[PDB]
Amino acid sequence: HWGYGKHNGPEHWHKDFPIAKGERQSPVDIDTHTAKYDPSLKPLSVSYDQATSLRILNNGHSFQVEFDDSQDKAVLKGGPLDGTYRLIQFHFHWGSLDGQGSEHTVDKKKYAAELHLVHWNTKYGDFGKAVQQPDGLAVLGIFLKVGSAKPGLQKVVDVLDSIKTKGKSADFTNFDPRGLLPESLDYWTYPGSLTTPPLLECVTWIVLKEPISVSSEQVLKFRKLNFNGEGEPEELMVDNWRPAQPLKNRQIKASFK
Numbered sequence: 001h002w003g004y005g006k007h008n009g010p011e012h013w014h015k016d017f018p019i020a021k022g023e024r025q026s027p028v029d030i031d032t033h034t035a036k037y038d039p040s041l042k043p044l045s046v047s048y049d050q051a052t053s054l055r056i057l058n059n060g061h062s063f064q065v066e067f068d069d070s071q072d073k074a075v076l077k078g079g080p081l082d083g084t085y086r087l088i089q090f091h092f093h094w095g096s097l098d099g100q101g102s103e104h105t106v107d108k109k110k111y112a113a114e115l116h117l118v119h120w121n122t123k124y125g126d127f128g129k130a131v132q133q134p135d136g137l138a139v140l141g142i143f144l145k146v147g148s149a150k151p152g153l154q155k156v157v158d159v160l161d162s163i164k165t166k167g168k169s170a171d172f173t174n175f176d177p178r179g180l181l182p183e184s185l186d187y188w189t190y191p192g193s194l195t196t197p198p199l200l201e202c203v204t205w206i207v208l209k210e211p212i213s214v215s216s217e218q219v220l221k222f223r224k225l226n227f228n229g230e231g232e233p234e235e236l237m238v239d240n241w242r243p244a245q246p247l248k249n250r251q252i253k254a255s256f257k
């Protein structure tokens, strides 16, 4: 089974998921001098005032915060998108050291971690149908750098002890993801894929230019999670990121200059 270790990590994924060597894989390095400013691009419209979080889960490769997506509560529109995309979950990728952990890079710089807010296009009716479409998903990517604490993130940090191992879940209601956004919503966008198996090429990536900062203590607590299940040999949940993939025949567009 796939993972991030030496014997089952990203370099092995292609043997069970040949789309891993596909033409629109993610993540990629954003070359800021090669990105094209596109003034046709609209501002992002993030409407999270009615988000309903439900649960937080350790799924064995990351932890997920899940939302009720049975109606248009928390939605993303605008930017390069056509239609309404509903939030279904968010998760992070992070490193064992502060100098690595993000999946996207900016002029080959790595950040300490990367936040993914996953949304699906309501025109396809449910999430499983949306991953089958080239415009099915929109993922908002936010970089984390280590600096001052992010107060909005502490509620998440404090519950991690209760979901330390794979398969553990905890009620997680009334969390407002607005607390995780940077001040500016300027972005880069490109067509890409899920960054874990099954690696489907169904994602319109929206990566925010401005990182958010979190303390060292906050990311420290991320690194205390376990990839393993309870009762199993302890394997710390670190470096759950996929390295940059070739851009191929793609253009990254910028919403700003």
Ligand SMILES: NS(=O)(=O)c1nnc(-c2ccccc2Cl)s1
Residues within 6 Å of the ligand: 089, 116, 118, 139, 193, 194, 195, 196, 197, 198
């Ligand atoms: N890292 S990510 O946001 O591109 C992502 N990759 N895989 C994802 C996924 C895979 C299977 C089921 C649900 C999801 Cl949300 S979400």
Ligand SMILES: [Zn+2]
Residues within 6 Å of the ligand: 091, 092, 093, 116, 195
């Ligand atoms: Zn992700």
